[PDB]
Design a protein around this ligand. Structure first.
Ligand SMILES: Nc1ncnc2c1ncn2[C@@H]1O[C@H](COP(=O)(O)ONC(=O)[C@@H](N)CO)[C@@H](O)[C@H]1O
Ligand SMILES: Nc1ncnc2c1ncn2[C@@H]1O[C@H](COP(=O)(O)O)[C@@H](O)[C@H]1O
Lengths: 421, 421
């Protein structure tokens, strides 16, 4: 949500945002609609208040003038319900539209879709294997580390891990939570469902509605990221300046409808409906430099986890067309997946300024007593099973076993994932 | 799903079983419908046969005997139509009814509802405090260990744990996966959703259908127990005798609608819609002896876990009217919850003989080459957040902090859970 005041004052700024980000929104039609709502609230002021006057004149009016006043009162009331109900219809239309206005991207955002994305940096590289490398599904198949029968039970885009890899999954999630807690984020284990209001807050509703699974006969939705929950915790609360920046490391199961197919056909561990994710969430003050400092920390944290995971990665500046309506700036971190001879997203770091704060109503009292919308940022800390696709392929040994990175040997108990059966 | 052959020769056993388990099932109506379906199938046999063997006699028959055979063919033909309409209609409701027939309770199960549940033994005393104890909610409030704001994001029966208790919720799940792996159970991390067929396989559908959330616009339901996934894995597979017993320790998020109204203020970490559960599942060969061995193993595992967690517990033989339609035996394990002065269920061990194997179609090739239905059993290994409630109350220190059991100190990194504030 954008400040309707700034929207009215400098709509060309939002017009470029709608153009470069590709939002289907007619800014001129929204702006128009707003004028009508303004107009109709004023006209409704007139009738409900002339009605106030007629009703005030009624109690001691002579019988002649008293019924004239009832007559006038009725017509005016008619008018008022007509206007009232027109306003409500128009305002709902305005709000829905307002919910589609995107934040302007940062000045250096590449303009265009995913193909405009720009590699910032690359640390580490494709492993040079002494032998012919298997892909992660073939490592799993060979060591008996996943349960293919899960598709008959739950459907496709499901996985069930077994043996050492079951254990490894859990070790990586705890690892990421421990690493976030030593970086000063407050670890939180959270639910994977939220009411609608929390999805609206983040911006997942309306634009990414397609992607969320509703829990039927409830008013709950399962969340695709712990971010829907972390962002809505302080809605309607005004935070002390001294609380800022809030740094939450939230773990929750994530659920995605994944209404959108894998061109690299369908499966393995890359795109499943249910996965586990530790999220990095920050609420900071409404300054660009506070945002920039948080974005760089969010980024370095994710890089740091990849270095401890010993994975080759690169950072990518996400183009306007691809960052989504509420993003100021987005950088993805992609890790190399040998079997596809390409980098794959494992983390997206977004800075959304106050676009989510004005929707989720997140506010703080600045050093001068002024209440302000906060700025929010988020980045993945670690999501499984997807990084398992990359750990298996980058760390596979000759025999098909997989070495665990040094930092994860305390969490596993061992240096090598053994086969199951 | 019971063996219809036993259902027909021992109906009194099933009648005692329907009454003692308090199942709402008219047994005469079922056995009657079963006889109607058998006579119809026999009769259809008889029809299709005579319709074949007179159409043989017909074509070139002495002209007068030919029309009598034609006449008989018209009669037999319309009768087959009728027989099939009735059979299609009556088989359907008999299958729907068989899906409701309870397994006979083991002889030693108390007969009565929840009130007849007999305590078998108790291990460990109430903790003795140099101070008046706080309940687990006041311990979480005091220490800043949960996030009350989640109620507004997600509704009631939600928890969000913070700081050391978030980390302690993950550490306990890992400990239970490692305890199980070391006991020979194969660790698996699972989805929390399955198709309806997996629920019919365990007995959760139809009887408990209302305890289960459905994912809307999807043919998937969220599982309240990993047992639903684990049990549907080998469906339609004929397992080799040598694979047996299959000992699986699965972890999945568990979702429960909790449609059971309310009564006591079962607030805090005790009854939530979403929790984490590590599950013991055994699929064994079809002998009682096999089952009793497994049952005891499952119980000793949950006992050993609770010993490791340094918690006072008791075992409870569940009564016939409380164990549920599929159970042969159920023994609940209850831990002492100091603030309620009562024991609360943490684990529930069930032996179901072949009642789920016949529903999910789990079979094995026995040592003589006979394909038999397997027996299944299951028990909680460790579920969070309910155990955290007994853990905080039982291990609370004078200062409102909580000691970590020796067993869990390697998982925790510390001996005491520190406050967030
Ligand atoms: N709504 C809930 N909130 C919190 N924990 C729960 C809830 N429902 C069940 N549990 C936990 O999970 C355990 C088993 O649940 P139960 O109702 O006995 O179903 N039975 C099973 O799931 C068997 N698979 C054994 O695990 C309980 O003992 C308790 O520890
Ligand atoms: N469907 C999925 N399956 C597995 N991991 C996923 C899935 N969706 C997203 N992820 C992971 O979660 C991260 C952040 O998700 P997103 O906020 O959508 O970028 C991605 O970089 C992946 O690590």
């Amino acid at each position: 949500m954008v400040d309707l005041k700034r929207l009215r004052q400098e709509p060309e700024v939002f017009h470029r945002a709608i153009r470069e980000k590709g939002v289907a929104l007619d800014l001129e039609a929204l702006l128009a609609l707003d004028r009508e709502v303004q107009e109709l609230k004023k006209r409704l002021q007139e009738v409900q208040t002339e009605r106030n006057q007629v009703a005030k004149r009624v109690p001691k009016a002579p019988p002649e003038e008293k019924e004239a006043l009832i007559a006038r009162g009725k017509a005016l009331g008619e008018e008022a319900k007509r206007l009232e109900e027109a306003l409500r219809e128009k305002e709902a239309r305005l709000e829905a539209l307002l919910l589609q206005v995107p934040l302007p991207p940062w000045p250096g955002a590449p303009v265009g879709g995913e193909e405009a994305n720009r590699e910032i940096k690359r640390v580490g590289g494709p492993p040079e294997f002494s032998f012919p490398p298997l892909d992660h599904v073939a490592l799993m198949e060979k060591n008996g580390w996943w349960e293919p029968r899960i598709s008959q039970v739950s459907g496709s885009r499901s996985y069930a891990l077994k043996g050492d890899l079951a254990l490894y999954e859990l070790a990586l999630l705890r690892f990421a939570m421990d690493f976030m807690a030593r970086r000063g984020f407050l670890p939180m284990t959270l639910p994977s469902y939220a009411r609608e209001k929390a999805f609206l807050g983040t911006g997942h509703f309306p634009a990414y509605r397609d992607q969320v699974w509703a829990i039927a006969e409830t008013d709950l939705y399962l969340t695709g990221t712990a971010e829907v929950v972390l962002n809505a915790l302080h809605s309607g609360e005004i935070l002390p300046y001294e609380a800022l920046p809030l740094r939450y490391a939230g773990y929750a199961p994530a659920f995605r409808s994944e209404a959108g197919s894998f061109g690299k056909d369908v499966r393995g561990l890359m795109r499943v409906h249910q996965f586990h994710k530790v999220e990095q969430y920050v609420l900071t003050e409404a300054s660009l430099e506070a945002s920039d400092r948080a974005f760089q920390e969010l980024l370095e944290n994710a890089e740091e986890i990849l270095r401890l995971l010993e994975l080759p990665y690169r950072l990518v500046e996400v183009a306007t067309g691809d960052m989504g309506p509420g993003k100021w700036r987005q950088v993805d971190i992609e890790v190399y997946l040998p079997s596809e001879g390409r980098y794959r997203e494992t983390h997206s770091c977004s800075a959304l300024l106050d676009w989510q704060a004005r929707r989720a109503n997140l506010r703080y009292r600045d050093p001068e007593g002024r209440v302000r919308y906060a700025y929010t940022l988020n980045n993945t800390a670690l999501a499984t099973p997807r990084i398992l696709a990359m750990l298996l392929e980058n760390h596979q040994l000759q025999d098909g076993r997989v070495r665990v990175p040094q930092a994860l040997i305390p969490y596993m108990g061992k240096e090598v994932l053994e086969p199951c059966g």
